[PDB]
Amino acid sequence: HQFSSLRTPTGDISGQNKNNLISGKATGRVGNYITVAVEYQQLEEAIKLNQLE
């Protein structure tokens, strides 16, 4: 919060108005999945696929 000050010759604030208390917020939300997928066939992994790790 932030405030402002009055300046008077003798300290009168009856005529004027006071400060208001406005409250604000910052919001955070979730994003999207970061997904990666692979697929291969049984015979492919049986003959060709080596050193898969």
Next chain:
Amino acid sequence: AVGYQLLLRMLSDYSLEPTPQVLSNAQRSYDALMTDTLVVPSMRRRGDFPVGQGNKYDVFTSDRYYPGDLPLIDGDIPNA
């Protein structure tokens, strides 16, 4: 009262001196006006005179001592 006091002031121009009955009537009227316009103010406290311990300060609005000036009535206007 106004008319009598005026009569006494302007009687010199016609050079007529006033009578004791007129003087008495003017006196009574002026005295009645004086009674109607009295104030008789009271004696406020000095200011350094202590307030008693039985007045329950620190809980009531009273302090240890009398204000000695018109006390604050609002707080928005605190200078007077």
